[PDB]
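fwd from M.: "can u put these together and see what the complex looks like"

so here's what she sent:
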Amino acid sequence: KTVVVTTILESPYVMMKKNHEMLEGNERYEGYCVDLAAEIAKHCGFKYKLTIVGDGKYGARDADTKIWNGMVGELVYGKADIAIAPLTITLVREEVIDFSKPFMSLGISIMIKKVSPIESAEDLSKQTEIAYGTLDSGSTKEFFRRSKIAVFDKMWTYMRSAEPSVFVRTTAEGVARVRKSKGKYAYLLESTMNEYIEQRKPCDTMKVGGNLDSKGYGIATPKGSSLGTPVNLAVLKLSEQGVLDKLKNKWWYDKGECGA
Amino acid sequence: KTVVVTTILESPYVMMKKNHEMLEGNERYEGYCVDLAAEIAKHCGFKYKLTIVGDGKYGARDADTKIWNGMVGELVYGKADIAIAPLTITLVREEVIDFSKPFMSLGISIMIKKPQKSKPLTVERMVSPIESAEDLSKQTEIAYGTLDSGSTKEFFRRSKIAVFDKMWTYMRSAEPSVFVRTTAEGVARVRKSKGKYAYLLESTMNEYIEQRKPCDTMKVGGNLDSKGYGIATPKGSSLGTPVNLAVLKLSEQGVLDKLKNKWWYDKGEC
Amino acid sequence: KTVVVTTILESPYVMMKKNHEMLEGNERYEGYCVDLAAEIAKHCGFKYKLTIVGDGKYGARDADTKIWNGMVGELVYGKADIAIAPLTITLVREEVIDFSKPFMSLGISIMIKKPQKSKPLTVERMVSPIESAEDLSKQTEIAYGTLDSGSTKEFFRRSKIAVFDKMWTYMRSAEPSVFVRTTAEGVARVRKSKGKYAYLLESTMNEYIEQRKPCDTMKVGGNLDSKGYGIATPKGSSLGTPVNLAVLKLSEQGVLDKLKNKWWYDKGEC
Amino acid sequence: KTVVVTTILESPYVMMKKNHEMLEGNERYEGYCVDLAAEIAKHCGFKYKLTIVGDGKYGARDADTKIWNGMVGELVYGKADIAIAPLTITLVREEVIDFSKPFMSLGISIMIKKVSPIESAEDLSKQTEIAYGTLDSGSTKEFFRRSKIAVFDKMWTYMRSAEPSVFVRTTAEGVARVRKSKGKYAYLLESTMNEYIEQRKPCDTMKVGGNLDSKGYGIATPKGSSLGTPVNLAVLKLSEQGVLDKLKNKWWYDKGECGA
Ligand SMILES: NS(=O)(=O)c1cc2c(cc1Cl)N[C@H]([C@H]1C[C@H]3C=C[C@@H]1C3)NS2(=O)=O
Ligand SMILES: NS(=O)(=O)c1cc2c(cc1Cl)N[C@H]([C@H]1C[C@H]3C=C[C@@H]1C3)NS2(=O)=O
Ligand SMILES: NS(=O)(=O)c1cc2c(cc1Cl)N[C@H]([C@H]1C[C@H]3C=C[C@@H]1C3)NS2(=O)=O
Ligand SMILES: NS(=O)(=O)c1cc2c(cc1Cl)N[C@H]([C@H]1C[C@H]3C=C[C@@H]1C3)NS2(=O)=O
Ligand SMILES: N[C@@H](CCC(=O)O)C(=O)O
Ligand SMILES: N[C@@H](CCC(=O)O)C(=O)O
Ligand SMILES: N[C@@H](CCC(=O)O)C(=O)O
Ligand SMILES: N[C@@H](CCC(=O)O)C(=O)O
């Protein structure tokens, strides 16, 4: 029995190869998440098929309709049996799906065009001259919405009541917006994504300040599934054996097509 | 029903208060784990009583006897119900108990005595004989050891990386023993060895000791691996899900990093 | 019974909200004084409705008619119950109304246009033609004036100090008039006069405007006197003691300091 | 009828004249408060007699006794009719006596022996290497005891549970302790007192940082007394005519027996 895997087109997690016209099956994908899924399948011993979620959504809740979208919605409604993807472990998501142990630590970071005048997020919130936003239907926007710390509340009130729409559909779109804003737009995204972008050409973006908080990516399964314990054990074994270190080094530092 | 909270005596996690002679109950202890458990109880309502393992071991399965010792050992057989303590999540431990999401990350670091400032225009420079782990393994003049019945020793035992394999090969055949019974004993060995000993401990305790007086020790290199501390709970128990959700709520709310900052950097004596 | 709170339209005390074309009631205004009124109502359980004086005057006495105008004027004749506004405590006002203890201090300062950088080793320096009130009184080229129907104008009118007496004699016989109907109008005069006008206003408004865009003005010298802002209440009213005790409680707690910090130093730029 | 005035021996408010063994009445006292009392009496029109409170205390509340000591106790129990002295205006004191409009502003200040390692009070609270304390039966210890801001609570807990007693009987004794502690002891006192001490010989002490808050000195009067309104109007008139400024200049910025 094959296992349907839902992923999202994200670099360096899932890339759609470069010469994929003649490729079929799982061989048309590449990235950290593809290798992680291969190792998970090898450890557990099942045959899997990689699939891209129809909507490029990580997972959220719509306007008071109690319907999950994206990869979380794909898992909840039985469309997929596992989600190997950069899916943040959050309280709201844990109540509907099971998360394994985190395989990669991360945090919220600020990305701007290439001493910065803002640096820390407090100066970013205090100064309204520059604009900042997040990725829609994600986990950073949900972090800012449900936050209670005053600086996060004022940041969220800025972003929600902003003209025009400060949110972006895809992190690539937000990166392009930051690059084309001539240093007038700031991006709030995951630290790993910011590092990967800043270590790649044309190297016109960079990360400022520290990390607002710390989270992690987990491998998600439908609630009450029979694969949660095997994937948890496989993730623990891979972390102990240094496979995750090797994969991160391969997909984040080994290429490094930038001078730094 | 009053459940017990088994915990280890480690700083700044749990330690006896200055006036701990006359108080009783949970008021005797202070640190990060005590108010972490207080927050856990505040979120999900349950009464708890702090307990300390007699042997003072974090947990490891003994060889040829198949008897788990330490905190994990007494948690498996039922003499405890939950362990709010710096217990490292490992595959060997997960096979017998249920862990929660890590409430704080950590790594394995190297602790050495801080050398004196180099005299040579009129600038002072800090030069250390060990800068990573590979050179520490290569050299011989500086000895290094781990903590007995800990996660670091277990990690080095089954490691397949060449550097860590060679480190374990050196450590097992060492005379006199380089292993210590407590992290306090390892820190004392580092401070009294005049640079002839290096301690391998978790990065959190390493930084905490580095920030406190007499601050004669420094940490070299990066983190050997990336791990975390999870709240332990016996397999099949009903407390796993409430504690997991409480940890997630605390992480999302900002209590966790505030506690870490106020118990790791606010008292930056050195 | 719903009482009315009279207040002047002054920044950053009370200003109309950006989206004030659809809101109503207390939600139409924001600033320092609305927060002060909210804290006063939180201390003692009374319901309030903000009102704005029609003439927009702080309060004075019309000459040869012995009548009060402005906020104090309409407070004396029973058309308001409490004046939570930046109203200066003066002897002439104390004879008709009751003033609580000051909730923040202030002083009369001088405001002039900020001069450009002096190019002439390669260090820029700021040189101002006015450095105190004495030289401002002595010089003639730069004109100066106070706010109409305000506390500073009255202070200059009955002053016996030689410098202030000379300044008042110059002001009363100045053609064209140097007095202004609003603080904003005076700041506009300073900005548009190209350095040929100086504005005498309270240090709080001076600093607030100096710390806001386009910030082409600066404060010179020191405070000509020490004064305070008191909550005004009609004579023989039952609210005087509660509001006085509330101001004391807020000062002891520190709400006044945080309000000052978050409305004077957190909203500044340049 | 003469009016009994209660004062406290404090410089530069009430001093003892150099040649006073042969002087009777109010002629043996000098200072800011003596001049203030003289001007108040001149404005209102009564004759007054200055007296020193039997216990050199400003006034506080005993432990579970509901008894006022010091000048406040001298006012409540009918021993005195008015108190022209550096008495701070506080909520707990306004419930037993009436305070006029403040005639001099002030605030908490930190005093050290002459790099400024102590710097702001947050560094004072974070560091247990250096010691500090307040005056007993005053308005600063009461401010620290009833405070709710975290730094003030931790300073208060440190001072109350300290060995030996960090508090001092008289502010002069506290200044002497600071001068004789070789920089090992800090003093918390009023800004005006700190400035007067730092501008006088041997001027081996100095003020560091900014005022922690802002209070004022008021001329106290027993509750429901007929003198409240006259003294309030007199203080207002004196402030508007610059008499208070002249007196402060005379007693603070006119002698200056130190290089400054
Ligand atoms: N260096 S990293 O971000 O790629 C990274 C981060 C992490 C890893 C492994 C790696 Cl390689 N494993 C840990 C897991 C292992 C065991 C201990 C904590 C969890 C359970 N989570 S983590 O601390 O989020
Ligand atoms: N900055 S820190 O080490 O105190 C720290 C470390 C961690 C925190 C929270 C903090 Cl404050 N939460 C995460 C948890 C939150 C959710 C995502 C990963 C786990 C589940 N684990 S963590 O990555 O080990
Ligand atoms: N720092 S400030 O100008 O915002 C400020 C100024 C003042 C405050 C409180 C603050 Cl926060 N309280 C005092 C009051 C408290 C008691 C002593 C004097 C009056 C009654 N008045 S004040 O000296 O005018
Ligand atoms: N410069 S000073 O400390 O000598 C000083 C301080 C103050 C003075 C007068 C002087 Cl000279 N008067 C004011 C009072 C006058 C009227 C306005 C505020 C109160 C009522 N209080 S104050 O702001 O505490
Ligand atoms: N890592 C995030 C991406 C969305 C975001 O950037 O907020 C997630 O999985 O939800
Ligand atoms: N935290 C480790 C012990 C500390 C160490 O090994 O340095 C454990 O749970 O085993
Ligand atoms: N606060 C003053 C008005 C401001 C000014 O005169 O500058 C008053 O109540 O009269
Ligand atoms: N000015 C203070 C002195 C007491 C102290 O310094 O604590 C008072 O009148 O209470």
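replying to her w this: The first helix of chain C runs from residue 32 to 43.
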